[PDB]
Design a protein around this ligand. Structure first.
Ligand SMILES: Cc1cc(OC(C)C)cc(C(=O)NNS(=O)(=O)c2ccccc2)c1F
Ligand code: NA
Ligand SMILES: [Zn+2]
Length: 268
């Protein structure tokens, strides 16, 4: 019997996938998690006692982004191993393809929180390899179900590229993406490339956005905005076509933006 439901913060969330919590935790009807330190617990009564004792009110590590009540904390897997392991176990409940939960030292984790008077409330996160041979600027990216489709995943995607820009490098999320992750990346890539084309080669779009040329190309292909000439993909779009796409329906929700002025981060 697996964990099939969690209590975290004020949320109850059904699981989507197996996550390898220890077997005596899986047998319970519900797993209870501290939303701040991510300790997982077996019983409502151990949970209630923890909440009265636990002094964390935000993620560990350093706050590398803060604008109003939106916060990102950078957590080195080697300096906060238990926390990062608990995060990985939580994420695996909602990610089919994640496979790494306990060997977190090679990773840095970026925790998105929404802040009120009580504390910084976890919304989702992405992990990133400290050293990525493959040029992945995201390893796993997860938004908790009650926050999905509300602009938070777009924020974290945009955030992963802002770090890539600061590293003077392109990057791409590690494959395979979850289904919602796929739709989300395609929509983010469209928005960013279309906005840059409104206001340029494929290589220019790549250097301006840190989106890889392959991701740019496959995005422009889905928009039917690339020609092929003698073995080369070549952008082929009119300003009017760009605006037709941009004011269409799916680009209408106002984003949580990443304000680079509020990003406190130096490339390793
Ligand atoms: C990357 C990602 C992962 C995710 O978790 C899954 C893995 C369980 C959820 C989201 C998410 O919530 N997307 N919706 S969105 O933020 O409103 C958004 C609107 C427009 C363009 C991009 C995103 C997400 F982006
Ligand atoms: Na649910
Ligand atoms: Zn706690």
């Amino acid at each position: 019997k697996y964990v099939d439901k969690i209590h975290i913060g004020n949320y109850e969330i059904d699981a989507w996938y197996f996550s390898p919590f220890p077997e005596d935790y899986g047998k319970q009807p519900k797993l209870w998690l501290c939303e701040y330190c991510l300790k997982y617990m077996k019983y409502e009564k151990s949970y209630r006692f923890h909440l009265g004792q636990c002094q964390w009110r935000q993620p560990p590590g350093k706050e590398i982004y803060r604008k109003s009540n939106i916060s990102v904390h950078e957590v080195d897997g080697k300096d906060h191993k238990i926390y990062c392991q608990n995060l990985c176990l939580l994420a695996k409940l909602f990610l089919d393809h994640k496979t790494l939960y306990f060997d977190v030292e090679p990773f840095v984790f970026y925790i998105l929180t929404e802040v009120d008077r009580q504390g910084a409330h976890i919304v989702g996160y992405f992990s990133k390899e400290k050293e990525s041979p493959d040029g992945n600027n995201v390893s796993c990216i997860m938004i908790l179900p009650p926050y999905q489709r509300r602009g938070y995943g777009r924020f974290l995607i945009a955030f992963s590229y802002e770090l890539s820009k600061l590293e003077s490098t392109v990057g791409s999320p590690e494959k395979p993406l979850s289904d919602l992750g796929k739709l989300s990346y395609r929509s983010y890539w469209s928005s960013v490339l279309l906005e840059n084309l409104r206001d340029l080669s494929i290589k220019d779009l790549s250097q301006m956005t840190s989106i890889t040329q392959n991701d740019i190309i496959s995005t422009l292909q889905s928009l039917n905005m690339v020609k092929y000439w003698k073995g080369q993909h070549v952008i082929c779009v009119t300003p009017k076509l760009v605006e037709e796409h941009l004011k269409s329906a799916q680009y209408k929700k106002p984003p949580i933006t990443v304000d680079s002025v509020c990003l406190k981060w130096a490339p390793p």
